[PDB]
């Protein structure tokens, strides 16, 4: 590995550990094994957003060409957000594709990903289905995201309606996360969600 890459990752890793934002349990970094090529990141949901109370694990891969290309980042924790794929965790954020700058850091990426949760950009969408629900029925997006925040990211309990329809359909033998997905993506239409689930 280029010495510039490993020295910089080590320094930026240490910096995040010692950060104030880590001290306030807002961001953190971990090793996954004895290298600095893959890291695990963690961000706390911003306050006054459906993600509040939740924590989101991040898969972080550092390319050979660091610091002149951005880290490759993906949500490991599932999340309902227009600029993050509800299926794969892929991220649409400019500093991870075309607006990377060599002076940016691990710290800076993590706080930008947190800011992205508090400020979705729905006309640069990643998940068309999420982004349309975001735009067309804001309150349903908010309650769906809060629900995903609760079941996947450890946030406190979400709307009990959504918990109801998830119950009714879970009784019919469907997998619980498949039901969550199905119901969320069909905008809590119990009919069309059931029609989709049957093709499993």
């Amino acid at each position: 590995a280029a010495n510039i890459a490993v020295q910089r990752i080590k320094r930026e890793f240490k910096e995040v550990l010692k950060s104030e934002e880590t001290s306030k349990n807002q961001i953190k970094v971990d090793l996954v094994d004895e290298n600095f090529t893959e890291l695990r990141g963690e961000i706390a949901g911003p306050p006054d957003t459906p993600y509040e109370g939740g924590r989101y694990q991040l898969e972080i891969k550092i390319p050979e060409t660091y610091p002149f290309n951005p880290p490759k980042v993906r949500f490991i924790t599932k999340i309902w957000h227009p600029n993050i794929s509800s299926v794969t965790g892929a991220i649409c954020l400019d500093i991870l594709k075309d607006q990377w700058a060599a002076a940016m850091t691990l710290r800076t990426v993590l706080l930008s990903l947190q800011a992205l949760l508090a400020a979705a950009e729905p006309d640069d969408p990643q998940d068309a289905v999420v982004a349309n629900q975001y735009k067309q029925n804001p309150e349903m997006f908010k309650q769906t995201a809060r629900l995903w925040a609760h079941v996947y990211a450890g946030a406190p309990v979400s709307s009990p309606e959504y918990t109801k329809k998830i119950e009714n359909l879970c009784a019919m033998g469907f997998d619980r996360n498949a039901v969550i997905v199905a119901l969320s993506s069909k905008s809590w239409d119990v009919e069309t969600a059931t029609e989709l689930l049957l093709s499993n």
């Binding site: 080590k10 240490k14 550990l17 010692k18 953190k28 970094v29 971990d30 090793l31 996954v32 094994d33 004895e34």
Partner: protein, 74 residues
């Protein structure tokens, strides 16, 4: 001189040490920072488990070296 200690499954810390510090000195530092009792603690460096008597230099543990911590289930 600094070293990294990790479970690789959700704990990762950095400690300030010297080459003369003993494996017992390190586990004490781990207990101070994370509260894990040293009898609970297993430290490993390049596959080989670390015994509380030796020092970091004995195992050739350098700056920015990574130590795996295993928490025994009790």
């Amino acid at each position: 001189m600094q070293i990294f200690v990790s479970t690789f499954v959700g704990l990762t810390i950095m400690l300030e040490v010297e080459p003369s510090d003993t494996i017992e000195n390190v586990k004490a530092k781990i207990q101070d920072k994370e509260g894990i009792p040293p009898d609970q603690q297993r430290l490993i460096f390049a596959g080989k488990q670390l015994e509380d008597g030796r020092t970091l230099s004995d195992y050739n543990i350098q700056n920015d070296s990574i130590l795996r911590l295993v928490i025994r289930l009790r």
